[PDB]
From a paper:
Hemagglutinin (HA), one of the two glycoproteins of IAV, is responsible for virus entry into the host cell. Affimer reagents display two variable peptide regions that allow binding to a target in a similar manner to mAbs, with affinities typically in the low nM range.
To further identify the HA epitopes of A5 and A31, cryo-EM was carried out on each HA-Affimer complex using a trimeric form of HA (HA-HK/68 H3), which has a 98.6% identical sequence to the one HA from A/Aichi/1968 that was used to isolate the Affimers. However, the H3-A31 complex was resolved to sufficient resolution to enable model building into the EM density. In this model, the two variable peptide regions of A31 appear to straddle the 130-loop of HA, which is directly involved in sialic acid binding, and suggests that the mechanism of action of A31 (and similarly, of A5), is through competition with receptor binding. A5 and A31 showed Kd values in the low nM range (2.80 ± 1.15 nM for A5 and 5.94 ± 3.27 nM for A31), demonstrating high-affinity interactions. Mean IC50 values of 1.05 nM and 0.35 nM, respectively, were obtained for A5 and A31, which are comparable to those observed against full-length HA, suggesting that the binding of these Affimer molecules is strictly localized to the HA1 head domain. A31 maintained high potency, although somewhat decreased, when challenged against A/Udorn/1972 (H3N2) [TCID50 of 18.22 nM vs 0.96 nM against A/Aichi/1968 (H3N2); Fig. 4D]. Overall, these results suggest that the mechanism of A5 and A31 inhibition is based solely on their blocking of sialic acid-HA binding by interacting at or around the HA RBD.
Author numbering:
A (entry chain C), B (entry chain A), C (entry chain B): 7 to 328
D (entry chain I), E (entry chain G), F (entry chain H): 5 to 91
G (entry chain F), H (entry chain D), I (entry chain E): 1 to 175
The structure:
Amino acid sequence: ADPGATLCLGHHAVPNGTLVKTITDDQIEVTNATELVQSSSTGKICNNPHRILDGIDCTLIDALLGDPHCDVFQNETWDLFVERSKAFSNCYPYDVPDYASLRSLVASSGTLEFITEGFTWTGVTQNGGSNACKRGPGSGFFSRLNWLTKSGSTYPVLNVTMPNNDNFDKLYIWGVHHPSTNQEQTSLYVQASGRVTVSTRRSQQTIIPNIGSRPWVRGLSSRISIYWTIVKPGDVLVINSNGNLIAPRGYFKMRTGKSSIMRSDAPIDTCISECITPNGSIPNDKPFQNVNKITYGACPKYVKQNTLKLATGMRNVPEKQT
Amino acid sequence: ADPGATLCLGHHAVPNGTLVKTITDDQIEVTNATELVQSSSTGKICNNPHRILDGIDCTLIDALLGDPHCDVFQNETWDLFVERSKAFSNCYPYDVPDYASLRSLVASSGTLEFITEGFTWTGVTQNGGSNACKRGPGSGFFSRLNWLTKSGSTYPVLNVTMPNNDNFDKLYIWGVHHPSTNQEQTSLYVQASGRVTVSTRRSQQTIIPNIGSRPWVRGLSSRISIYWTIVKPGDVLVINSNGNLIAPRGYFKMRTGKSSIMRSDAPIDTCISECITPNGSIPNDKPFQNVNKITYGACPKYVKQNTLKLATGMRNVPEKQT
Amino acid sequence: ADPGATLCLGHHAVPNGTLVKTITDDQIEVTNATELVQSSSTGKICNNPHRILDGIDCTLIDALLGDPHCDVFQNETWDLFVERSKAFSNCYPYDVPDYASLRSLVASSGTLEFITEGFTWTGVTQNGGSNACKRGPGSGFFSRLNWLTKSGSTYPVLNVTMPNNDNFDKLYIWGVHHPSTNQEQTSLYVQASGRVTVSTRRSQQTIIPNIGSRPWVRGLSSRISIYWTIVKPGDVLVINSNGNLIAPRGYFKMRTGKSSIMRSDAPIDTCISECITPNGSIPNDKPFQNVNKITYGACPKYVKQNTLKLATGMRNVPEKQT
Amino acid sequence: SLEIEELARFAVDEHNKKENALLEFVRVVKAKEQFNYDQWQDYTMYYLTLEAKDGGKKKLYEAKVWVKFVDSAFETENFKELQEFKP
Amino acid sequence: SLEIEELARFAVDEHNKKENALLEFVRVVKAKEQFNYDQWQDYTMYYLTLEAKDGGKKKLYEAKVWVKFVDSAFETENFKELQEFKP
Amino acid sequence: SLEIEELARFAVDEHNKKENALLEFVRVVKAKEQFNYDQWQDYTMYYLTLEAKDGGKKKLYEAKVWVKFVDSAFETENFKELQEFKP
Amino acid sequence: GLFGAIAGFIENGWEGMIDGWYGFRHQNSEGTGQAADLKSTQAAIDQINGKLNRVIEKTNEKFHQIEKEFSEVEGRIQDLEKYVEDTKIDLWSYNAELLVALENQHTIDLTDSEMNKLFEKTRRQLRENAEEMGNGCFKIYHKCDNACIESIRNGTYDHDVYRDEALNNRFQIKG
Amino acid sequence: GLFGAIAGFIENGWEGMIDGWYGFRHQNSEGTGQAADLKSTQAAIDQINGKLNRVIEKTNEKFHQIEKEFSEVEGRIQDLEKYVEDTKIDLWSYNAELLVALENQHTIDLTDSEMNKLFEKTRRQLRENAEEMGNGCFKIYHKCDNACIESIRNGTYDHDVYRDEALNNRFQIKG
Amino acid sequence: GLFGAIAGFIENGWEGMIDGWYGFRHQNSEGTGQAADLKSTQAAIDQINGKLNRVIEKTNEKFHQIEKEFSEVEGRIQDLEKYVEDTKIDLWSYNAELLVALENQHTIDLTDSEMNKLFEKTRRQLRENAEEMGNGCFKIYHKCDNACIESIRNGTYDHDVYRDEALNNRFQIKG
Ligand SMILES: *[C@@H]1O[C@H](CO)[C@@H](O[C@@H]2O[C@H](CO)[C@@H](O[C@@H]3O[C@H](CO[C@H]4O[C@H](CO)[C@@H](O)[C@H](O)[C@@H]4O)[C@@H](O)[C@H](O[C@H]4O[C@H](CO)[C@@H](O)[C@H](O)[C@@H]4O)[C@@H]3O)[C@H](O)[C@H]2NC(C)=O)[C@H](O)[C@H]1NC(C)=O
Ligand SMILES: *[C@@H]1O[C@H](CO)[C@@H](O[C@@H]2O[C@H](CO)[C@@H](O[C@@H]3O[C@H](CO[C@H]4O[C@H](CO)[C@@H](O)[C@H](O)[C@@H]4O)[C@@H](O)[C@H](O[C@H]4O[C@H](CO)[C@@H](O)[C@H](O)[C@@H]4O)[C@@H]3O)[C@H](O)[C@H]2NC(C)=O)[C@H](O)[C@H]1NC(C)=O
Ligand SMILES: *[C@@H]1O[C@H](CO)[C@@H](O[C@@H]2O[C@H](CO)[C@@H](O[C@@H]3O[C@H](CO[C@H]4O[C@H](CO)[C@@H](O)[C@H](O)[C@@H]4O)[C@@H](O)[C@H](O[C@H]4O[C@H](CO)[C@@H](O)[C@H](O)[C@@H]4O)[C@@H]3O)[C@H](O)[C@H]2NC(C)=O)[C@H](O)[C@H]1NC(C)=O
Ligand SMILES: *[C@@H]1O[C@H](CO)[C@@H](O[C@@H]2O[C@H](CO)[C@@H](O)[C@H](O)[C@H]2NC(C)=O)[C@H](O)[C@H]1NC(C)=O
Ligand SMILES: *[C@@H]1O[C@H](CO)[C@@H](O[C@@H]2O[C@H](CO)[C@@H](O)[C@H](O)[C@H]2NC(C)=O)[C@H](O)[C@H]1NC(C)=O
Ligand SMILES: *[C@@H]1O[C@H](CO)[C@@H](O)[C@H](O)[C@H]1NC(C)=O
Ligand SMILES: *[C@@H]1O[C@H](CO)[C@@H](O)[C@H](O)[C@H]1NC(C)=O
Ligand SMILES: *[C@@H]1O[C@H](CO)[C@@H](O)[C@H](O)[C@H]1NC(C)=O
Ligand SMILES: *[C@@H]1O[C@H](CO)[C@@H](O)[C@H](O)[C@H]1NC(C)=O
């Protein structure tokens, strides 16, 4: 008893295939295609497992400065500061030279662990403020610097030393004043051309401010410029100034950790999500994306295509024939 | 009737093969090879379809400034400015800090569409010139700025504003003056150390010039330095000066388009060619090249090899035997 | 006479295989593996075939400056300078703005071939020194620049010229002085705010120094800052100054050759080795490494992996079974 | 009304503390805040013109009371100081 | 010859416009262009010495006519101004 | 002891050279090196007080001998100059 | 792919396959059937996830970077920051275009190889009986039942009791 | 290539091929002939132009870039601009060298693939008649004429009227 | 590899091979022997050094570079120098990873290819006598001695005297 049978091999086909690319062709379609791209976005920024600090009408440089409408960011260590696209700075408009570095250094610090220090300023009256800065009726100012000015009728030169005896680094965010007219410079201080001098054992920085009229932003015209210094273990910082002082009231703790900054406008939700992209915090289950290039956390990088579907399957053979 | 025949397969061979590379060998030869490299150059710059503005004895920055031997570049929008290696600058030698930035910004603007504005300069006499700059007998100068100076016996301070109410951006090319001796600064202006102030609502720039003897270039020794500003929609520019003023007579339209600059020495011909490389404008039918890395237009990039011949064919089998 | 035999093919197996990676797997083992990485280091810096100049307590910038404990580096052309991690600068502590640029240019110069020039300084007494700099009892200084200062009771302005008539380029390493108090600037020179001017036909540089107190480093507090100038063939340098000169006594020969700098702590031995790596000069028989990224000579680049073993052999089949 | 009189009392008793004598306030004649370029978001000096009856006679005074704003109740309050008290 | 006299005629009438009086030119004695560092590509001030017969007597004068070059006929021409007219 | 007298001998003959004078040293009264901020690694001026017996009388002097350090025997030695010789 | 196993000589897949990748269709006297060979597909999924979780860990672990988009133009440092950012993107996009382009070339070759490996394993298990037809599907020349499929699907199949039968009908005697 | 097709067992090409790539040479009783199989090469040119216009659009579309060569040395920013410009060139030159090496290895394998694909199609169309010789050129064991080549060149060829003949002369009866 | 030659149907290598890579074991009436085929491995070592001195010249010939590690943070230029530093490393580490992972996948397919090429060369030298057993190791059906291996190891081997009889015991006559 013998018969002729068959055991024809083959494979599986589905009539809903998706087009992919090959290096010898241009458009072929397969039985299965995972989109390695991630162009979708849920649109919710989630606050776990990374600690996410979100402003309401607050930006990070004004968060460290302590805008007197954002005084909830005292301390409040973070992992990602999300600024808001509807931001506005109600406290004494400023112009920092070299803006991208200071924002990047602070965002890499990772923590706003402030601590006061006993500074023996002699011959000054600290705690000055402005009228645009407001916590209700009255006045206001930044909550982390001293708006130094003159006292009586004089302005003595300043020499202040701080021996860093401990085992951590120190940041001293300070400032200089840029008046509008010569009358502003000669009234706040008694110097026509003030001088600041910051010295450590390694390097030094000397700045002479500028005078001139400016367009109005929320009143006045003037600006202040922010500078900074880093003190290593076993180093002594000497601050010398002849005028135009905005001297700090403490040192900001550094940390060699993992923290970033980002700009978006999505509000805050509750999730357990690791990757945060602007305009939608997306999950990382694919190696590529097409959302904005800015990215915090272990989640993929920008490629400019739209459908790089890796074939997790074989080449489509549609069911010929009818 | 049965016989033994053959149907012996094979392929094609030519006794003129070209050597190619493979990752498992070093030098094999094939039956056909296209040179993906482009080392040849016709040596003619062609003015179509890209609009090519070519100088004769004129560079781009002196074309903006209106060198008074180059007054054919008024307006004259372009796509690629070709400077000449035989160039010279007959008008008041200058030194522009960040020269690479200004040349790159203007060559990206793509269009020299000037427009005057009604500037109410008070207490100055504009339209000053030099004797090196010449359009024949007499004097000459740049044709796009105002060589400001003193009037009568004084020099009043200058406040000017220009409300940008329209939807486009504005560029203002202005300058500083660096005299040679102290007598030059005291004669032209009435300030020993002049000051300028350029301010928008965003940012500001304040410059104090330098004084000193210099080697002679075409006479005098002195130099001028070129600065600039950008005004956004709904922004106000205020220009303040105490001395050393070279103020513009209008604003240059920006354009977020597609334009470049190049340095070569080839003359101008008539073609329809898209790729323009210096030292020969070559056609783009290959994905690589070996001519200079500077490149304008959709045409390939530098690879340091010489013969990258892609095999448009099979491995050569020379006709063994004799 | 017919029998059934076998000619079973196969391969070689060794029961000592090493694990390698594949793009379709994660960890597979093969019969042979060369470690393309180089993580080992012999720990000896060898002085052949490339000429290696090694300091003992001497850094490169102080080597050109001629530290008066480093006067063995007069001339002594090199190919690679190895600074020592136990370094200390005993001569008048300094701050070099754009320090990474000057160190890179000098390390690329390749040769410290000095040559004097007869400068006609008028009204100065050169050859000043300090007490930290010492060659035994007495005083000392840098051995390559003139510590200019005042003479009699006045201080004339300085105009000097040096026509480069020859075919080689010229480097002029000069300096500015930054005193601590106003009394130091008033005593050494007769200028409260000194001015320095360096001019060639192309570019110019004007520096105004800084005054302020500083932490003590080896006595005093003051610093000097180093500037420099490059003169092309057929070009002229004019040095004009009003005060605070440290003017050079010659020009350093440039060279467009092959030389670098490196930082390590290994001592000097005798070999014939081409690749020099900090923390161990390793041989280049492999195209990858895991030792430090700083590298001179034709020897490979950094890869962060540890075991990148290329299979110079086929896949292990361990000898199943027992 | 109350602010100008309070600043007048501050000026007169700071003056009295400084030179160790006694003067008494009566009323304020003119209080002209400067409006040259800006009077707000910064120093807001009050040109205060006062007369006093201390030696039995009326004497005019002008006090340039430099009233710099403090930060709010997070920090110190009540900032004022007399730059100069001309007669 | 013609340039120095024309600038002298410019010097007297730009003088005459200012004080509201009348002076008449006669001739030029000395015209010494400065050669201290540079007289060309910039200000080309002519030390012009003039004498006039207006009050019936000869009076010496020196005018520092700051003749800054203009740009060419694309822009304005004929630039001259009197810095100071000393007697 | 030997250094203060040697610079005293340097101070008198430099004054003798500059003024074409002839004064003779006797002894040194006080040698007070300044210690305001720093006296080392730089200028190390000696406040030198001297008395001379040349004109039939004793005359006091103060010399601000600016003793800048030289580089060593690779370059010149024996550096001293008199800034001012007040009586 | 390059082996030509898939879309070289098989012109149609099938729709009843939902539980596997490389089915074993047949026609016998007991009826048409369909049985997924579990061991053949499982290695192919083992290989295709061997590369899949390989590329899952291809994310940038950067916790701090440089500026990526700008609201102001300033020139040289702006262009260099844009040039480094742009040239990173083409190099990564060319790589991502390259990385995909080999793996579909790899995957079509893997299912090209896995079909050919299944072809050879079906061949070398018979080697005198499973004479090819060229249509990408075999032909077994002996009598066959449900014991055929349950054996060939697994690793065990004897080729001594069926070898002597399928060479009989591969030959036609003349006469 | 890796299949060993070209220059693994064919030791010589031919010079009469000017109209195609993969020729079909033969010797019969009607004379020596030469006929380029059109469909075999046409798919091959579709494949290699499949990768050719793929790399034709590999030019940089940059309408504004950074400075590429310099007439002055200034140090830190100069070296970074030179380092970025250098490292782009070694990465692209490697990528050019990697692309040329991969597609050359692809193309030698591609014509290596088409030769086996022509080999197997010539095999699987006969599978009992086209017994190989190992020289990369076949041997058909039945009587053959011009109707042979014009059929085998196209897709249509019967293997039922010629099957009963070519198995006869592969057999040598003993006796 | 993708051909399945190594670890696809051969389940054990051997320890006696110290002079070569692709051994030729045998069992005859004259005793068990071992003879490494010199020409087959010589192509394989030539091929594997063909890529090895290709990657030997993969060192950077830079005689002056920029700072690669830092003892001070300054921000924007520091991060860009660190960004160009870092992005170079992953692009090179990936390329090193993309190097090695292809070259093992090359090598396992490379070493698999001459395993199949030696399979085909042993096949095409017989094509009626070396019938595969499927275990990745052949079976010669005629009487065999030391003259066998000394011929098959080299290029010369006749298939006319041994063709006759090895077809006799490939057949089992029924009756
Ligand atoms: C050098 O040149 C600059 C040029 O920019 C001058 O700067 C300008 O200075 C003037 C005053 O010195 C500024 O004018 C002020 O504008 C304010 C904002 O304008 C809003 O309100 C007006 C209504 O008046 C609207 O029309 C307009 O669209 C805006 O919405 C006004 O608030 C100011 O006061 C006016 O309003 C208040 C409201 O309470 C009234 O009490 C006042 O009486 C008055 O009516 C004032 O008009 C101008 O804005 C400045 N320019 C810019 C761009 O801001 C410098 O002053 C000049 N330097 C010197 C020394 O002159
Ligand atoms: C501080 O130090 C600098 C050093 O660079 C001084 O700068 C030099 O200044 C002098 C004059 O002050 C310049 O000398 C001039 O050179 C011109 C160019 O030289 C060409 O022509 C001469 C022929 O004389 C050739 O030999 C030479 O090779 C060049 O081809 C001359 O043109 C000048 O005038 C001469 O020619 C004209 C032609 O019409 C005659 O009318 C004149 O009478 C005269 O013969 C003049 O000689 C010198 O060039 C400057 N240096 C450089 C490098 O350019 C500063 O002056 C100094 N500061 C102070 C305050 O002194
Ligand atoms: C502005 O503010 C700055 C603050 O930094 C001031 O700078 C300081 O200035 C003082 C003196 O002006 C410096 O004090 C000196 O310290 C030296 C080093 O200290 C070592 O030795 C002491 C023992 O005295 C140890 O305790 C210490 O741990 C160190 O190991 C001393 O050497 C100095 O002299 C002492 O030692 C010598 C040795 O021979 C004795 O002869 C002396 O009598 C004395 O005992 C001196 O004490 C201080 O170091 C400076 N700061 C820094 C950070 O260096 C500026 O002075 C100030 N400006 C003005 C105008 O006041
Ligand atoms: C918020 O930050 C402030 C600093 O501005 C913290 O105050 C210091 O905290 C440290 C941490 O224990 C103490 O060692 C210091 O003694 C504190 N200084 C002062 C002046 O209070 C403060 O603790 C932080 N937390 C809260 C809730 O305010
Ligand atoms: C060349 O450029 C000038 C600007 O300097 C042009 O003049 C302006 O052109 C615009 C465009 O229509 C007008 O809106 C302005 O009113 C013109 N201003 C003046 C002062 O003329 C000029 O039209 C351009 N073309 C030519 C041929 O000169
Ligand atoms: C692969 O295909 C199967 C059946 O069509 C499907 O169930 C599965 O989800 C696919 N895998 C994907 C989309 O990753
Ligand atoms: C999210 O918004 C940004 C604007 O900053 C835009 O560029 C981006 O395309 C948006 N995302 C998607 C997925 O379109
Ligand atoms: C064209 O000239 C440039 C000089 O700018 C040179 O570098 C280049 O090599 C030349 N082109 C060729 C093909 O040699
Ligand atoms: C050599 O020392 C350096 C310190 O600069 C260190 O980073 C490196 O890891 C060391 N080498 C090895 C192989 O560990």
